[PDB]
Amino acid sequence: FGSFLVSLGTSFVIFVILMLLFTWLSRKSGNAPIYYPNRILKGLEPWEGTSLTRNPFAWMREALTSSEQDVVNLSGVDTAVHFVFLSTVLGIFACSSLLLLPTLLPLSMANITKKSSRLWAFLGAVYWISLVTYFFLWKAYKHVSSLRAQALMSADVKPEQFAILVRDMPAPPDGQTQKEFIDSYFREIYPETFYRSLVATENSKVNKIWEKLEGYKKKLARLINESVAKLETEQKAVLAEKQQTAAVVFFTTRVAAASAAQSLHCQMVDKWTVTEAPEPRQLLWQNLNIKLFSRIIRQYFIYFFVAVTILFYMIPIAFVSAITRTVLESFLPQIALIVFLAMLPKLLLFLSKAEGIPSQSHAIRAASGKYFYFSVFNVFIGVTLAGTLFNTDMIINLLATSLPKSATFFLTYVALKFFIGYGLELSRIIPLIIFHLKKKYLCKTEAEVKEAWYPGDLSYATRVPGDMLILTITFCYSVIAPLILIFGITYFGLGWLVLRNQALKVYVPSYESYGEMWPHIHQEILAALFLFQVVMFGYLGAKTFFYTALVIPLIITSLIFGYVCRQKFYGGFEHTALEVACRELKQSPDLEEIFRAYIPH
Amino acid sequence: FGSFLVSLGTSFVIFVILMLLFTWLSRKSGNAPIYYPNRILKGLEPWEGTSLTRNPFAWMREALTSSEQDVVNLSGVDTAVHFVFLSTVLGIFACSSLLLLPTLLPLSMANITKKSSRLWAFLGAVYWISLVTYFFLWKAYKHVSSLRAQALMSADVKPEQFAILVRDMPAPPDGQTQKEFIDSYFREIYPETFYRSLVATENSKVNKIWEKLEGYKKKLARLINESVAKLETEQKAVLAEKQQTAAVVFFTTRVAAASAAQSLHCQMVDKWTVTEAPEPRQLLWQNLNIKLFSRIIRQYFIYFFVAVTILFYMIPIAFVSAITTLKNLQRIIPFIKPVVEITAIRTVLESFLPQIALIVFLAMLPKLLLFLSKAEGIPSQSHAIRAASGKYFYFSVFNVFIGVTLAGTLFNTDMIINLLATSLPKSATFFLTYVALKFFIGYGLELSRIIPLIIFHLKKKYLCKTEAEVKEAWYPGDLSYATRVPGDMLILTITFCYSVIAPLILIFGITYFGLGWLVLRNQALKVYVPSYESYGEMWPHIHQEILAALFLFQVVMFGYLGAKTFFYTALVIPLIITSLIFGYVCRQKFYGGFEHTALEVACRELKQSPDLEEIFRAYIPH
């Protein structure tokens, strides 16, 4: 039945890996090992060495032996955190080796015939999974916190440390504009440890003017005067009589800034909401000018709209996905779901960043959260509706919820995410074709680097939640059908390998976010596990033997584990600690460069 | 049912209040007005003795003319906050005026009609109640935030604006002692803005018992002869090995202390951990020892225990309490002359004898709860008291409410089995006897008016051993927020539960709260004195659970309205969403200023020549 999809996937990997080995060992090396030219050559060869050292395949080199500190040397701590996430999920699904050999051995109903056929073994399996996940999650969480501390205390001096973002503000002083109002206020509150302070202004007439002028200047190759005059005029205009509500404030020592940010500032929380100032390149200067009601009103309207769009996908798209010479009919709904769900990281990110989230490093996280809500209800409603439209007592319901939906769609969809997916991702075939087309067609006149050259960040906004849909669809069916357990374990293995290659050779991070997005990942893994435990409570209950009173303990255990983890480690993921603040770097920093690092245009 | 209880009720209240108007109007005041003679003695004989004046106008007029500023100046900000609680619940129960008259007009029995059109007005009453509660909560919870800010801003040098409570030191520096480790650390972080640090002492048990024994022995009029054991043990143990994991540090200036306290201190939050130091007389040196994970373990075990308490409460403990009936007055009717049964009203008393045992348990409950919370790593007194109120409130709801109310709203649509079977009648008996406790609450407001006067006045003569006019035992306790708030919110929860199912009891709710407000404006303007001035940070809890009671009321109206069969119970779900969202917006619009002493307030105070030597001596216990 579904074997055609796996065959197509393995053929696609054969093709794309053939293309990789045929193309990377060539003069296209400016593309496939892209992270090395920038950050001057360290992989500018099909090795880190001379003498025709191609030897395909060449991942017996550092690709497999990538020191956990080597990666954080060659990429931000964010990359190392993502790797520990991949490794931990691989660990959970691998340490479940004493669930695939025993529980699959119990092979006219085809599944267990609703009669005591060691359903106790199923309870054993659910305990084993719910136990190994706890163990690995704890270990990994300690490890990530240790990485964050280690790279946070030895980091160089960066302008994100001497600053806070004072998001809200009582606008009127009634006789003076806002710059001197901030001056008076923070001077009263923080004497002699307070350097200077930008006041967030408007980006319209000019910010767009600067963008257009930059475009015009870029056009110069082998008019502008009016543009630069307008720039000067609107620039002088904006730095006066606009002086919006929010602002950003710089302190003279690393200790005092990290002390202020975690603090409070007026005995009515709805005014002067200081917060650890984000990194310069992700400050998101658009959403500052929002009071504390507007954030909440916007947020609840956004959640209502997310619920509405959840329904507007789950009716028609799940109907279409419940569809199942027929081989084309077997392939079609796969890519149909890929297009119906491959959109909407973008709409979620737009919608979320419109909730006033004042930093890209948090907009990405919020979009990932909303996407996880989409994913869970994808699994739930998709399988339920597929089973129902498959059928027309409860035993029939059990048979339909177990075998068809999983064994066809959930088994093969991951295969559409691995072989064809990671296969396309590693070769970077389509970036290769677009780059070469850019070279032949209209180029940037030797500004090819300032052209289709620059890789994005690893985009930990479609790679995180995208590679968690299958984590959920894996935990949920982990003991229903260990076949997807083998599929998920091989998925995360291939993902670790190919993504280590890409992180070491091609990708270049944009922001830093030293360690965040891990507690989010942890809470999300835990939520997947909790949903798994509830679903096995349900299915085993449908199997009419009452070890459900034995399964409830795991539900309580997951809730309590969440509480203890969030309270015993996840308070260190919101602030640089005062100790680390005192030991960030002490070599006489100058505030002037820092201050020049937040001028927006 | 409750008719006889109210008959006891108002009669007892009248008799006791007559006793008040007799006894208070006398030269033997002493404790009757108590706060005033202690404080400044100004209110002692309030310009007329409170007696030569018209007695009903003597006390009531003074009470009814008080002001928030007056009460704050006399008592503090906290009792005035409590009055805001009483007034803002009185407002909710009162301003629902166009819900008592219009809903009584509609009044097998035709008392309620199964699928009437007239029932499409209970939903209107529920919206009116929920809306008026939203408005009053918001108004009160701006007003209290204003009070907190004003009280903080106007205060003066108090020896907790300069301290924090670092309490999870990793024990070993491995080559020296704890105190020098902590001092070296905090000098590494804060240079020139860290004054000196005090570390708790584990063997404070033995030093405190020596100090207590010495203080007792000092009562030799006919702490004064306590040299050898006290000094030897204190000094040698403080130096040698009592250094615990916890300590109190002292920063130079208020801004620095506030900024440190609101912060953290080690990128691993399982260690050095900082909370705002409580008042000198509030923090519990007995509890600073506990680490974090140990505190979590103790907390969850405690909560599991209290859940077992409610369950097995409405199970054999209270079951055999009900069994403890002691029929026909324990068969000693020859010893009893009222055996003639002309007082057949004695039947209710014989039935409440098991309810008297239940009274015993409910009177022990405030102490039983408060002990648990204090033994859970709660590093203060105010926080422990608030936690005790929370535990008592959960107990009150899942005791009085949920049994009977859920049984009605649901059914009206081995040992475990018969335990649950007997539990259902147990719930109804509990509800009836609890409303009886409410009439006992009327009697108790009167009892608060009188009794410890008699106990105290007995001491001046019965003991009369060595008092020497200095054994002043007429020392009031605080307006204890350990029994006032939870037992005064039991009335609120009952009121919302039957707000429109039996909308007659809004009159009883207003009765109770108005009487409490008046007696507590008196009985707190003249007698009570608070022991710890937490500047108002008990109101967020009162809000959370008044709203919780409102949410419970919304759910139960959904249930008991859907029991009536017509398309109701749909226009109620939006109200429940409203209550949850209102909770969220409140907690994100005011709950900040109720934790962290407001850095702006901390610095703008502009202290006039403070010191610190006269401050570290305030935190030293002995």
GROMACS .gro file of C-alpha atoms in nm, chain A residues 138 142 145-146 148-149 152 185 188-191 255-256 258-260 262-270 272 292-293 296 299-300 560 563-564 567-573 575-580 582, chain B residues 138 145 148-149 152 185 188-190 255-256 258-260 262-270 272 292-293 296 299-300 580-581 584-585 587-593 596-604:
model
   98
  138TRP     CA    1   1.653   1.621   3.341
  142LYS     CA    2   2.112   2.049   3.340
  145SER     CA    3   2.188   2.537   3.173
  146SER     CA    4   2.556   2.454   3.213
  148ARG     CA    5   2.440   2.879   2.900
  149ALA     CA    6   2.641   2.959   3.211
  152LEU     CA    7   2.762   3.343   2.927
  185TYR     CA    8   1.341   6.031   3.629
  188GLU     CA    9   1.665   6.060   4.052
  189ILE     CA   10   1.647   5.681   4.065
  190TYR     CA   11   2.000   5.586   3.949
  191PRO     CA   12   2.246   5.863   4.030
  255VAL     CA   13   2.636   4.494   3.714
  256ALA     CA   14   2.393   4.781   3.736
  258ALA     CA   15   2.150   4.346   3.476
  259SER     CA   16   2.040   4.460   3.820
  260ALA     CA   17   1.798   4.717   3.686
  262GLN     CA   18   1.531   4.228   3.665
  263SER     CA   19   1.396   4.495   3.900
  264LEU     CA   20   1.075   4.699   3.926
  265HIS     CA   21   1.047   5.074   3.884
  266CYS     CA   22   0.717   5.226   3.997
  267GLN     CA   23   0.452   5.117   4.241
  268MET     CA   24   0.197   5.084   3.963
  269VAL     CA   25   0.321   4.807   3.739
  270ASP     CA   26   0.146   4.956   3.434
  272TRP     CA   27   0.784   5.204   3.331
  292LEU     CA   28   0.016   4.768   2.883
  293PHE     CA   29  -0.350   4.737   2.792
  296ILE     CA   30  -0.308   4.235   2.638
  299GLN     CA   31  -0.285   3.927   2.260
  300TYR     CA   32  -0.631   3.797   2.337
  560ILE     CA   33   0.468   1.744   3.901
  563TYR     CA   34   0.647   2.207   3.821
  564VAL     CA   35   0.977   2.097   3.970
  567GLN     CA   36   1.105   2.593   3.943
  568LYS     CA   37   1.448   2.437   3.984
  569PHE     CA   38   1.623   2.535   3.661
  570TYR     CA   39   1.411   2.761   3.446
  571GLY     CA   40   1.464   3.073   3.650
  572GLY     CA   41   1.816   3.094   3.515
  573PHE     CA   42   1.695   3.135   3.159
  575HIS     CA   43   1.853   3.698   3.321
  576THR     CA   44   2.226   3.712   3.332
  577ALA     CA   45   2.304   3.661   3.697
  578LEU     CA   46   2.472   3.935   3.896
  579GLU     CA   47   2.779   3.717   3.943
  580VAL     CA   48   2.813   3.660   3.570
  582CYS     CA   49   3.043   4.110   3.739
  739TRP     CA   50  -1.148   4.686   3.999
  746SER     CA   51  -0.275   4.992   4.528
  749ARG     CA   52   0.008   5.083   4.935
  750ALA     CA   53   0.199   5.337   4.730
  753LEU     CA   54   0.532   5.324   5.136
  786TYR     CA   55   3.130   3.679   4.779
  789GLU     CA   56   3.309   4.061   4.508
  790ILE     CA   57   2.971   4.151   4.360
  791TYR     CA   58   2.880   4.470   4.539
  856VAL     CA   59   1.785   5.171   4.625
  857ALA     CA   60   2.062   4.912   4.635
  859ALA     CA   61   1.553   4.698   4.657
  860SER     CA   62   1.744   4.640   4.334
  861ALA     CA   63   1.930   4.346   4.480
  863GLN     CA   64   1.419   4.194   4.321
  864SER     CA   65   1.710   4.026   4.141
  865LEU     CA   66   1.885   3.689   4.136
  866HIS     CA   67   2.249   3.612   4.209
  867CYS     CA   68   2.378   3.288   4.051
  868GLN     CA   69   2.314   3.178   3.694
  869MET     CA   70   2.209   2.843   3.842
  870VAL     CA   71   1.891   2.912   4.043
  871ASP     CA   72   1.929   2.637   4.299
  873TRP     CA   73   2.223   3.188   4.623
  893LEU     CA   74   1.504   2.448   4.775
  894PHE     CA   75   1.435   2.093   4.659
  897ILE     CA   76   0.943   2.159   4.736
  900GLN     CA   77   0.527   2.149   5.023
  901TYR     CA   78   0.385   1.878   4.799
 1181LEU     CA   79  -1.083   3.380   3.387
 1182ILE     CA   80  -0.975   3.668   3.162
 1185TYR     CA   81  -0.549   3.740   3.410
 1186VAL     CA   82  -0.582   4.111   3.337
 1188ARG     CA   83  -0.287   3.985   3.783
 1189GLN     CA   84  -0.102   4.160   3.500
 1190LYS     CA   85  -0.227   4.510   3.585
 1191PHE     CA   86  -0.179   4.536   3.961
 1192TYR     CA   87  -0.006   4.229   4.104
 1193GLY     CA   88   0.334   4.377   4.042
 1194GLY     CA   89   0.326   4.658   4.291
 1197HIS     CA   90   0.880   4.443   4.537
 1198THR     CA   91   0.877   4.779   4.719
 1199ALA     CA   92   0.892   4.989   4.408
 1200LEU     CA   93   1.247   5.112   4.338
 1201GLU     CA   94   1.121   5.465   4.265
 1202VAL     CA   95   0.969   5.478   4.613
 1203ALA     CA   96   1.289   5.329   4.748
 1204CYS     CA   97   1.513   5.607   4.627
 1205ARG     CA   98   1.292   5.915   4.616
   0.00000   0.00000   0.00000
